[PDB]
Design an enzyme around this catalytic site. Sequence first.
Site, PDB file in Angstrom:
ATOM      1  N   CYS A 186      22.571 -23.863  20.995  1.00 54.19           N
ATOM      2  CA  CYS A 186      20.809 -23.238  22.011  1.00 54.19           C
ATOM      3  C   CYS A 186      22.140 -23.897  23.215  1.00 54.19           C
ATOM      4  CB  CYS A 186      20.341 -23.881  21.796  1.00 54.19           C
ATOM      5  SG  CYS A 186      18.616 -24.003  22.947  1.00 54.19           S
ATOM      6  N   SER A 200      20.523 -24.486  25.828  1.00 51.32           N
ATOM      7  CA  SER A 200      20.096 -26.373  26.475  1.00 51.32           C
ATOM      8  C   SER A 200      20.846 -27.482  25.950  1.00 51.32           C
ATOM      9  CB  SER A 200      18.405 -26.890  25.858  1.00 51.32           C
ATOM     10  OG  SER A 200      17.680 -25.941  26.159  1.00 51.32           O
ATOM     11  N   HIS A 259      23.794 -26.592  28.741  1.00 49.91           N
ATOM     12  CA  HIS A 259      23.125 -27.429  29.567  1.00 49.91           C
ATOM     13  C   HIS A 259      23.991 -28.739  29.980  1.00 49.91           C
ATOM     14  CE1 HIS A 259      20.846 -23.981  30.669  1.00 49.91           C
ATOM     15  NE2 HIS A 259      19.945 -24.426  30.630  1.00 49.91           N
ATOM     16  N   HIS A 317      19.947 -29.747  18.464  1.00 49.95           N
ATOM     17  CA  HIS A 317      18.578 -30.028  18.770  1.00 49.95           C
ATOM     18  C   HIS A 317      17.937 -29.316  17.862  1.00 49.95           C
ATOM     19  CE1 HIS A 317      18.832 -27.230  21.970  1.00 49.95           C
ATOM     20  NE2 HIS A 317      17.751 -26.765  21.869  1.00 49.95           N
ATOM     21  N   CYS A 325      13.540 -24.424  16.946  1.00 48.77           N
ATOM     22  CA  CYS A 325      13.638 -24.325  18.425  1.00 48.77           C
ATOM     23  C   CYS A 325      14.062 -22.908  18.801  1.00 48.77           C
ATOM     24  CB  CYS A 325      14.663 -25.425  19.575  1.00 48.77           C
ATOM     25  SG  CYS A 325      14.499 -24.635  20.628  1.00 48.77           S
TER      26      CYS A 325
HETATM   27  N1  LIG Z   1      10.854 -24.185  27.107  1.00 42.08           N
HETATM   28  C1  LIG Z   1      11.573 -24.809  25.758  1.00 42.08           C
HETATM   29  O1  LIG Z   1      10.897 -25.200  24.974  1.00 42.08           O
HETATM   30  C2  LIG Z   1      12.729 -24.214  26.201  1.00 42.08           C
HETATM   31  C3  LIG Z   1      13.461 -24.265  24.266  1.00 42.08           C
HETATM   32  C4  LIG Z   1      14.553 -23.896  24.050  1.00 42.08           C
HETATM   33  C5  LIG Z   1      15.123 -23.145  25.594  1.00 42.08           C
HETATM   34  N2  LIG Z   1      15.034 -23.178  26.248  1.00 42.08           N
HETATM   35  C6  LIG Z   1      15.836 -22.387  27.673  1.00 42.08           C
HETATM   36  O2  LIG Z   1      15.127 -20.794  27.216  1.00 42.08           O
HETATM   37  C7  LIG Z   1      16.549 -20.541  27.780  1.00 42.08           C
HETATM   38  C8  LIG Z   1      17.051 -19.430  27.547  1.00 42.08           C
HETATM   39  O3  LIG Z   1      17.858 -19.805  26.126  1.00 42.08           O
HETATM   40  P1  LIG Z   1      18.794 -19.572  24.568  1.00 42.08           P
HETATM   41  O4  LIG Z   1      19.588 -20.152  24.038  1.00 42.08           O
HETATM   42  O5  LIG Z   1      18.258 -18.139  25.163  1.00 42.08           O
HETATM   43  O6  LIG Z   1      19.637 -18.352  26.062  1.00 42.08           O
HETATM   44  P2  LIG Z   1      20.551 -17.687  26.532  1.00 42.08           P
HETATM   45  O7  LIG Z   1      22.444 -17.803  27.611  1.00 42.08           O
HETATM   46  O8  LIG Z   1      21.279 -17.178  25.189  1.00 42.08           O
HETATM   47  O9  LIG Z   1      20.051 -16.233  27.103  1.00 42.08           O
HETATM   48  C9  LIG Z   1      20.034 -16.599  28.088  1.00 42.08           C
HETATM   49  C10 LIG Z   1      20.207 -14.788  28.991  1.00 42.08           C
HETATM   50  O10 LIG Z   1      19.524 -14.770  29.950  1.00 42.08           O
HETATM   51  C11 LIG Z   1      20.589 -13.369  30.877  1.00 42.08           C
HETATM   52  N3  LIG Z   1      20.889 -14.012  32.408  1.00 42.08           N
HETATM   53  C12 LIG Z   1      21.988 -14.871  33.037  1.00 42.08           C
HETATM   54  N4  LIG Z   1      21.430 -14.730  33.692  1.00 42.08           N
HETATM   55  C13 LIG Z   1      20.575 -13.723  34.178  1.00 42.08           C
HETATM   56  C14 LIG Z   1      19.524 -13.252  35.904  1.00 42.08           C
HETATM   57  N5  LIG Z   1      20.612 -13.506  37.069  1.00 42.08           N
HETATM   58  N6  LIG Z   1      19.189 -12.186  35.457  1.00 42.08           N
HETATM   59  C15 LIG Z   1      18.899 -11.650  34.319  1.00 42.08           C
HETATM   60  N7  LIG Z   1      19.411 -11.862  32.913  1.00 42.08           N
HETATM   61  C16 LIG Z   1      20.135 -13.265  33.064  1.00 42.08           C
HETATM   62  C17 LIG Z   1      22.055 -13.788  30.110  1.00 42.08           C
HETATM   63  O11 LIG Z   1      22.901 -13.094  30.119  1.00 42.08           O
HETATM   64  C18 LIG Z   1      21.347 -14.185  28.517  1.00 42.08           C
HETATM   65  O12 LIG Z   1      21.858 -12.635  27.606  1.00 42.08           O
HETATM   66  C19 LIG Z   1      17.546 -21.796  28.180  1.00 42.08           C
HETATM   67  O13 LIG Z   1      17.275 -21.386  30.063  1.00 42.08           O
HETATM   68  C20 LIG Z   1      17.267 -22.484  27.462  1.00 42.08           C
HETATM   69  O14 LIG Z   1      17.227 -23.816  27.970  1.00 42.08           O
HETATM   70  C21 LIG Z   1      13.939 -24.039  26.270  1.00 42.08           C
END
Ligand SMILES: NC(=O)c1ccc[n+]([C@@H]2O[C@H](COP(=O)([O-])OP(=O)(O)OC[C@H]3O[C@@H](n4cnc5c(N)ncnc54)[C@H](O)[C@@H]3O)[C@@H](O)[C@H]2O)c1
Lengths: 374, 374
Positions: free
Chosen positions: A46, A48, A51, A67, A174
């Site tokens: 993921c 995260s 990160h 996780h 997740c």
């Molecule tokens: N709130 C929660 O409980 C929780 C749990 C899941 C993940 N997270 C967060 O959710 C987010 C997404 O996770 P993921 O695994 O899908 O990530 P990921 O990196 O696979 O997807 C993010 C997407 O954002 C796009 N992106 C990046 N910068 C951009 C910009 N400036 N404009 C437009 N698009 C842009 C990328 O091209 C990518 O396809 C992360 O920040 C992660 O840490 C949060």
Amino acid sequence: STAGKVIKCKAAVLWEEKKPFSIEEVEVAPPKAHEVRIKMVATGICRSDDHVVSGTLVTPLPVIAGHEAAGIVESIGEGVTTVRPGDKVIPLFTPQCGKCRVCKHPEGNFCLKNDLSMPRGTMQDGTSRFTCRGKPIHHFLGTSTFSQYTVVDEISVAKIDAASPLEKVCLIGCGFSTGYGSAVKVAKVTQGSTCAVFGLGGVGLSVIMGCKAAGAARIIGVDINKDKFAKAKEVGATECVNPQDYKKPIQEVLTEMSNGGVDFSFEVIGRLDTMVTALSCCQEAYGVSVIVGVPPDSQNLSMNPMLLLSGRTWKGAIFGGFKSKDSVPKLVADFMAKKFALDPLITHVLPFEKINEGFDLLRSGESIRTILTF
Amino acid sequence: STAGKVIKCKAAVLWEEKKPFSIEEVEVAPPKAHEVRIKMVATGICRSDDHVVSGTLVTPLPVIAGHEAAGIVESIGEGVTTVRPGDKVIPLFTPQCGKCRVCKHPEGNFCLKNDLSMPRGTMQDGTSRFTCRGKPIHHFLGTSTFSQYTVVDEISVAKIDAASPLEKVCLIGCGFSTGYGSAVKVAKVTQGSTCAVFGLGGVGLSVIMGCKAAGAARIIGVDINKDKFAKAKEVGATECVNPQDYKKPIQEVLTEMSNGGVDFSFEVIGRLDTMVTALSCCQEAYGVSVIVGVPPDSQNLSMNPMLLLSGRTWKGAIFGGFKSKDSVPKLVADFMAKKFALDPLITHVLPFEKINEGFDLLRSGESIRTILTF
Ligand SMILES: NC(=O)c1ccc[n+]([C@@H]2O[C@H](COP(=O)([O-])OP(=O)(O)OC[C@H]3O[C@@H](n4cnc5c(N)ncnc54)[C@H](O)[C@@H]3O)[C@@H](O)[C@H]2O)c1
Ligand SMILES: NC(=O)c1ccc[n+]([C@@H]2O[C@H](COP(=O)([O-])OP(=O)(O)OC[C@H]3O[C@@H](n4cnc5c(N)ncnc54)[C@H](O)[C@@H]3O)[C@@H](O)[C@H]2O)c1
């Protein structure tokens, strides 16, 4: 036999920020009272977890990250009543103690026993079950799934159907649950509505699945990587837009496309600028915007409160708003009953020893979810 | 008979920011199609009218301010169907056209014909009905109630009970309805909950009335002027706190008092810093915070989005969320049946000619609402 003994096994240790994971032998102590030791079967990669490597997310180092996973119970400590050796389980990065004011509330899920607000990187008792080359190693969100064996508190594990396919249902730990719940539980998307989803990774695709299940009429995907658009349409997007194709800020574009603003928007990236853009693109009198992405540590956003005074609602959530231990088993049962699909999220399947190659696939933009198999 | 003729009357003209109002003769044109000319009977002094003087709330000058009022219809333009000469009426600073996407939505009230988002200071047709010293004078929020006579669009007026006491029910045109609805309609305060109300003026006291009507168990009033506490307790506050008395930030104090954060908080002042404080003091997983106070023009707040990611909801509203023309008559009927009280808000009464003394009373901290009689 391993019950009651220290286990020596392979794990991916992160010794410092901005370095590859180190695949090497660690020692895993037996479970103490109210603890569960799990043999891992599959774990997802993921954003995260990435990160932690980049310094976006702060947690004590050195650490065993991971996780999003599924495995089989190897042994239980004294007093455990909700799982037994041999059971299939999913570790819960958001715990569910059942006894705090949040667990008792009808709509809360951010249990006060969490290790997310102010991360310590330990078990509930303040100690660690891991060592590597003689040095104690920290846990991550009470889960630490990038290891052949982990130890978790009982409040951080749920028992699931004995017939489920662990290489698929690890995503319920997740990414799937987070995105789906953000749409159906947190935003409460309505039939016939217009939605905008910022970020088309594994979590944003799961948001799209939830908006489609809730009966949205229009679902606009937003990403700077146009290679993400085909899969977004397969799972329900009606249209996709790339901000770098336009000579005007994307909030203005989305407001015009929706004849005055969208009903529901979702930030699923982790950037301060896109959180404010996503709020602004929802309709000013009755729109709802949900923050899902995780932003760089200790950074504040800037916004004009007139965006809220007109009538907008702004919220965020962890894990899709789901009470974790109650919800995870039900989500697995729904998957077994064909109520939703997980295959669209899985682009790559690799052995655990190829963890660094899996992180390179995520960073290059080429994958959605890589599933690592032990 | 004055129907169809220009009326010469007295009004309070604001020629310049930061100066007293000028009580002097103006010319009021007769109503055009779908317009209504009203003989004013009573008008309240609200902090938003003061915001025009101080430059907090930007609208074109010179202007006739006033937006909280009640009067009697003098004449109607061609095509008016919802009011007649002699009817008692309340001007609506938030219109209700009945035809836009907001008016048709179940929750929305911020009608797209409003003059709030980007005030122009005209009638719906882009012109003015007022002249003074031979020059055209701007309207304010489509109402302009600091005048013996005003002209409003039909979508900006509601007919009320013929037996209504206009010197009391003028408060239903802004301060009472705004505060009461922010609690009962926008926040949806629940029985047995704990609420925190920032700012104990006419609008904040009306928030307290709504929280008590909804069955809250605890209602904590917050103000830097301790002289406001006695009236807050009379209308339902269970405790009052002055931030200046404490060495710690008031969000920390309120979190401790509420054993981990309040259920519902309300910002009823108009400061960026108290908007962020009010959000922070509601419980991190399930709390709700509502912005009511008007912010300094064009200024942005700074905040950490982790306050929202844990589960908080942040919203704002105009006029308590009420659809104006549907709601105002029903609120008057409820007042006539003693369902709520308005006398606790009225601390001073003056003739209209003493408007500047009424603003002095507000600015010194001595008044809640001064009611001006024509
Ligand atoms: N709130 C929660 O409980 C929780 C749990 C899941 C993940 N997270 C967060 O959710 C987010 C997404 O996770 P993921 O695994 O899908 O990530 P990921 O990196 O696979 O997807 C993010 C997407 O954002 C796009 N992106 C990046 N910068 C951009 C910009 N400036 N404009 C437009 N698009 C842009 C990328 O091209 C990518 O396809 C992360 O920040 C992660 O840490 C949060
Ligand atoms: N959203 C809407 O539709 C709407 C309509 C009504 C009024 N307004 C706004 O609501 C606000 C309240 O109006 P009112 O007429 O009750 O005003 P008011 O001035 O009578 O009351 C504000 C109160 O805030 C207190 N205060 C000032 N600074 C403070 C600080 N730093 N900390 C704590 N308390 C502080 C004052 O002592 C005062 O009692 C104003 O900003 C007004 O413009 C909004």
